[PDB]
Design a protein around this ligand. Sequence first.
Ligand SMILES: O=c1ccn([C@@H]2O[C@H](COP(=O)(O)OP(=O)(O)O)[C@@H](O)[C@H]2O)c(=O)[nH]1
Ligand SMILES: O[C@H]1[C@H](O)[C@@H](O)CN2CC[C@H](O)[C@H]12
Ligand SMILES: [Ca+2]
Ligand SMILES: [Ca+2]
Ligand SMILES: [Ca+2]
Length: 539
Amino acid sequence: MNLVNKAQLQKMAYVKFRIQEDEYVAILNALEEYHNMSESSVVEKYLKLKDINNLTDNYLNTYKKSGRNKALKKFKEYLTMEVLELKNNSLTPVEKNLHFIWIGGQINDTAINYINQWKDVNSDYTVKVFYDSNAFLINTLKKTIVESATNNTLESFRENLNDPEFDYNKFYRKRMEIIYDKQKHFIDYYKSQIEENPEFIIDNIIKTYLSNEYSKDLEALNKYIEESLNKITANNGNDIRNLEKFADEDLVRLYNQELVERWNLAAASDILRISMLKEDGGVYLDVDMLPGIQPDLFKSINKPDSITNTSWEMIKLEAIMKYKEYIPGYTSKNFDMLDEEVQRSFESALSSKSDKSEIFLPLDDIKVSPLEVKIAFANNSVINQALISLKDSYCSDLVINQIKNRYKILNDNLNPSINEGTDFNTTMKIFSDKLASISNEDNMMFMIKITNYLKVGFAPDVRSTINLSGPGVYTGAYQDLLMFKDNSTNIHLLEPELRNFEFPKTKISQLTEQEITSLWSARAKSQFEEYKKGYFEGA
Ligand SMILES: O=c1ccn([C@@H]2O[C@H](COP(=O)(O)OP(=O)(O)O)[C@@H](O)[C@H]2O)c(=O)[nH]1
Ligand SMILES: O[C@H]1[C@H](O)[C@@H](O)CN2CC[C@H](O)[C@H]12
Ligand SMILES: [Ca+2]
Ligand SMILES: [Ca+2]
Ligand SMILES: [Ca+2]
């Protein structure tokens, strides 16, 4: 898997009596100078491979019938192989920063209890729980608007409950039309306030608006802010509103779009996490992840043949929490179904262990290449719930570029659509038609997945987020990397290629109570039925 010589390339691409074209010399010259760059940095080496790939298909484009072409297509696959070799040979320990994010409301104790597990076992990591001191009321604002929209939609359904098809589908359709109006009424208010007074603070804009439009109590909202601030402060809180240099101005603008306009705290955290990893370096984790387990801990308890690998991983964390009680309240529903004898196998192994680092596996030195961002996998697909990146890595810039290029397309078409539209439905049709008019083979799936952006958080089965700030931006970056592109949207990378970037498996437990619970946000008919029930169950 060493990269072919200039001389070896001449052998592959040989055509008897054929003139050496300028475009072909160019490739050979360039490949020679690559092999002369052993002292160069890995990024520099990667950039040279990249210049070489571009020279190659300049030849392939200029001479489409050439007999060199079969060999030159092979060579391009060899260049891609060479990226992996550089990557595997350029590993170095990440900065020992451990990042979490909680924005738009008060951090729960459940989040704090999981975070502490990582804190206790990683003394040599700096734990930073990122928050936004301007924005403790995002969830309050959203919940208020949504509540108001739900209640209005039920009043329009009051005489049509028992029949025929005033059902969950119609509910969400009509409620969303109301949400849109209420949400745009806020955004317009916020936008005008920010024009008038650009020093103005988000939470202050929000309390004024809730106070005036939704009769909310100023005192109560002020109190909530104080409690939220006090709570994160006592828990390694890092205010993003202190930090100076991290702020790419375009990314900042996307962060506040997601935070203040769209109320999508997941997307805002998607944007924030990669930005902090580029600026700080380290390991990013969602607050629902737990440390890996020491491999040897339960190594001698054989899994009952009937139980799945997934259930068994789940059972192991539950055994830890039953007998050590590190997170109080942690479920034991699965663990309690095992035969008495197996429960005691777990109990005994947990008996002889004194400290938490004999139970959980500390991160210690994690090695990573400047060319990559490591990522967690769930179900054969990447998931950005855990990430690893050196400060200022090449691949962190690929991810950030993907986010910006995607949002650009979203905004350039969505902003005019919002401006021309008397309502949700007219805006949507306008937006969809605009997307249709510029769609092609490469961006068609992306265009399809971002069409329902305005419904994100308010309706079921929406996948816009994944394809703007989530998992899709990572597969796009990895394809950019391997294929020497900067625009990947149509993905041909398979799982085994994507596995080259997986987060070290022993160093994370993804199958926690909170995450499994969060995997259930499948359709909630129940919600439309529970909202329904909350109209006979009162005074
Ligand atoms: O109110 C919220 C909700 C989510 N998040 C961030 O979004 C991450 C992922 O959210 P969640 O696990 O609920 O999303 P899901 O995994 O279901 O896509 C969390 O760890 C937080 O960093 C946040 O800051 N505030
Ligand atoms: O914030 C992330 C979360 O960290 C991951 O589990 C992937 N989720 C998919 C949708 C959104 O991107 C969200
Ligand atoms: Ca009072
Ligand atoms: Ca730093
Ligand atoms: Ca989750």
